[model samples]
Target: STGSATTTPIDSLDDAYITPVQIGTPAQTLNLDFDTGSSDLWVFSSETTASEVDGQTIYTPSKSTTAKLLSGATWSISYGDGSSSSGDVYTDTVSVGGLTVTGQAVESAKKVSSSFTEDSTIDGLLGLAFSTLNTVSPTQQKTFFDNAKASLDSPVFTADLGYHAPGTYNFGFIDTTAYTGSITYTAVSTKQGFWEWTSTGYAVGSGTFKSTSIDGIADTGTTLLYLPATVVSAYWAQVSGAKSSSSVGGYVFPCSATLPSFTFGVGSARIVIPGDYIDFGPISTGSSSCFGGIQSSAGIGINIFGDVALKAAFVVFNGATTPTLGFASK
Candidate 1:
């Protein structure tokens, strides 16, 4: 019932991974951001008012005979960036990576934040985080993975994120061939409704490894890799002419500057991020300054191993009786 599916980069920076999903009896397909940060499988739907939409593909529940209006159920979610969406709920057949979850709660967006409306690249978000993060009211709904875990062969899902290219998300089992070397495993804390774990340490380029316990989430929803100011500062110092800019938000360096590779420890395993990834394209179309992919997460208060970090290795989310996170070289 479960297999693998490809996720495409929505933009040049590989900022977000968009995957196709099929919903309803007729298999209405739409593109969804596969986010491991949130737990709401909401979609832009026919119910979404005209003003809130850009060019997104909407899910029309009325077109599907199997779609059921989940009476009295509603959902509302707001992100730290102040963007939000809210609407009523319905149950429908949802399919992803060849796995099908019938009666999955499909939140239909009646209103969406201006930020979300501007980007038509994503039809909606398909959250893969713990069901505890779900936002549905009255009766909180389980995430798609939680609903299908029992029937899966191994109750594991792996992500192989690519750089400016297509990546694969595997369900049910981990394909050993997808990664090189053995996997390093660490316990995951679901108390915060995230894939939270502590990183053993980090090294900037070939520099000495700093043994620091960095707690962070393996969030596929986030675009950049964020660590502590200490770690971020160390990484940028090595880059020539790199400086933190107030207007640019994070550290910025010359576009042609040679960035050092960043290495982080997963258990004893070392995941090295290439320098090229650190040089996240220029600030603007033709700007000489470039924003760094690895930034300080001081404000957020939690490090995020987002796409920039995840793309360096194959990640396994073992949702067994005791959840554990595994990382391996690709």
Candidate 2:
């Protein structure tokens, strides 16, 4: 069954890619991986392991006649998955799809793991999420889209993640389909890259949830939905007392019987978590078994809505312009 949201279709072309519009020369090109969860762009170089570049596309400054390196620019990217790469920065002509821009700032990693090296097609990543999270510090250089937004003919930046469908971390294009052509906006916290929203209330199944405290960030980067203990117990009560289980570093409750649904109140907006959350794979969360949607990260000091929250609503990262977020009815 589908949710209450509508869908919009976007065209994805085969030659679609992001290039450096302005950097070293007017023709230097670098493939960019559009990421929302994390910020930073990384590419492979001659120093990369041969095995890592087995089937991946490696960027060569030698091949690109116009590639220019920032004499002193360098970077090291550490992902949530514990993977990292260290590399030097360069400026080149970048192109994405049919759009060509100039002097785009990019990073080409000399050292990377097999996981990134194997995923070819896109040479590096382009994080359009937040300025603070971006590698090209405002103190150092402006972000690609940040600069592009100022001078592009249309000054438009979009990621087509749905069409490219490059598995999990795909970026590009605001999902118009997810919200039926209408997108919403929410101001960013400006403290960290986390998106924060106050919880008006919560509900389990058809029952009402008490006026318990609920507040935190809505992060697409996190893999699970982290709620508070009171909220957890209330949600757990909806389950058929089938007990809880754990998997990996998280938890998931499973029962032979069906479970009740959980809904979250974001101000005037309401989002429901289906009963199927009890089967969100499995993760070990200590001696007590819990639901994957509700894991232990108590000390983290913030509740995170991972993919679960993202699937329920259409999220947009408009850091390039007003540097704020917008969320509409989805």
Candidate 3:
């Protein structure tokens, strides 16, 4: 059997997709961020300080007959964006869509950073990266997909992310009707627990594409696209009022400025990001300037093809063999 479910974006926050999942015997449902960037199935829970959680749903192990504590087990993780969460571990029956996995490790948060505690819309995170990256101390844990893959018809999943629209995450099979053209599959190198690949090159606006190699990860958890400093500077140069601001933390320009489209080469195909998508809302409330969604991955080292870039195409995360990335125009 296979599993599938529709994912939705939070209002005004198109950064991540939330997938509904059930835990325990009585089935406590929680809306979790399906993050391909990290590998830990963690959730807000009764183990946390009640005052720390606000408007977020918590998972209670005591309420579920199928729950069991992995005594002395714990987990802690910190993201590049500085957001973090740490918790104790519990094994329970976890289900997504129609597929269920018994003895699944569910991390119950005992502490969370302000970035997570403030985002009341998200109850927790479901990591889809390699199981080797799982943060459980003493021993690692497997993700829901990994634990259920053996029962699935095939070991594969598709990420269909739409801008401000409902999208679906399909597991074990590809829906041909969801995509319009043939998918171009590229070999993925997963040493970092991410779907990492090298792009042939990129271009600014309608400019000629260059032959430069860029190594990056296909991250659903990240909000914006991060490229090399040289690439980022070239794109901003074409904008009239664009400037790197220390205050705003990245490049910003007048909201009315006409931006150019950015294109990147993936194998023999080119995926273009529309200019409008680069204007990532506004810098702040009542501000006339807006932040550019594309930035330099200087400190991070590896580029990130976040939602802004992935939404422009159909992506297939193949876990069957030598994990590959399949991309096609929507």
Candidate 4:
């Protein structure tokens, strides 16, 4: 069994963070958005139409001696953002942190939506969800973690997303130094093929906790935290100058307005997110009004604890027989 001592530093890209991953022989490094909500390691590759390729780094399977095209295997998937991609498949060497997995499915994109093609910061998304969600047809493939876990000292990984700062992802083992105090464990439901966990409730500032369980997926790949419309409204109501707008999109408030800290419960534990975290960047450059990081999930139909919520704590995705999610203050 092996563990990676090296932490894969997650670099920020505007509102998102992308981590580095090496694919193919001799290693062609590309920035990948680590997504826990989906299971398909598709990438903009040599197979992608040149018209669709922007400045993204593409994986060239033909150049890697170890890359073997998986004839007849193909995959297609769409994201919540409505971006879709479809392509042929190949098996190649893929590595994250220092944990390497050979014969990993590398979906080569033949066509990608403009939303993805225009975003050059990320070459692809490396899915960390269950293999059952894999999209490869004829022969569905396992996720990077799924294939690598068998050789890991521990079948797990930890994500620590920082607020506008460098963060990290540790594979196969937890870093005690990465977090503080004790971790509160909660049951995870993979039936939906996500690391879904329920929060005990939430509190606005020093007020009483709502105590109603909020079920959501821990998605590091997403940009903001999304809760029920009423819950989001409750949070925005506490702040002065905060107003909901369809024209401006969602909620916006004075950038200098004092914001109340958000507290969410994890079992008996409480994790506090600073008010600063909710103050997302301005609506426009030099604009006095700013957008929020927490928004309504009414339209999306699912609550998601994306990077906005993830950056507040250290998260553990335990790939046990009965999977569980662990959260700790950082």
In terms of lDDT, the poorest run of 10 residues in model 2 is: 1-10
Which parts of model 3 have CA positions greater than 4 angstroms off? none
What lDDT score is found at residue 128 in candidate 3? 88
- Could you say which candidate leads in lDDT? 1
Error of 2 at 269 (Å): 1.2
Please, what's the RMSD in Å of model 4? Answer: 1.8
Tens-place lDDT digits, model 2, residues 161-180 = 22222212212345455455
Cα lDDT tens digits, model 3, 1-330, are: 778888998866476778899999899999999988888999999988777899999999999999999999999999999999998999999988787889999999999999888889899999988898999998889998889888888888889988778788888888888877788888899898998988889999999998899999999889899999999999999999999998889999998898899998888898888898787878888888999999989999799999989888889989986899998888
Give the Cα-based TM-score of candidate 2 against the true structure: 0.67
Candidate 4 per-residue lDDT, tens place, 242-312, comes to 99889887889888898888888899999998888888768888999999888889888789998888889
If the candidates were sorted by their TM-score against the true structure, best first, what order would they fall in? 1, 3, 4, 2
Query: Which residue pairs collide in model 4, if any?
Result: none
Please identify model 2 stretches exceeding 4 Å from their true place.
1-33, 51-55, 97-99, 113-124, 136-139, 151-184, 194-201, 209-215, 240-247, 255-261, 273-279, 282-294, 320-323
How many clashing pairs per prediction, in order? 0, 42, 0, 0
Clashing pairs in 3: none
List residue ranges in candidate 4 displaced over 4 A. 1-14
lDDT of each: 0.92, 0.53, 0.90, 0.87
Query: TM-score for all predictions?
Result: 0.98, 0.67, 0.97, 0.95
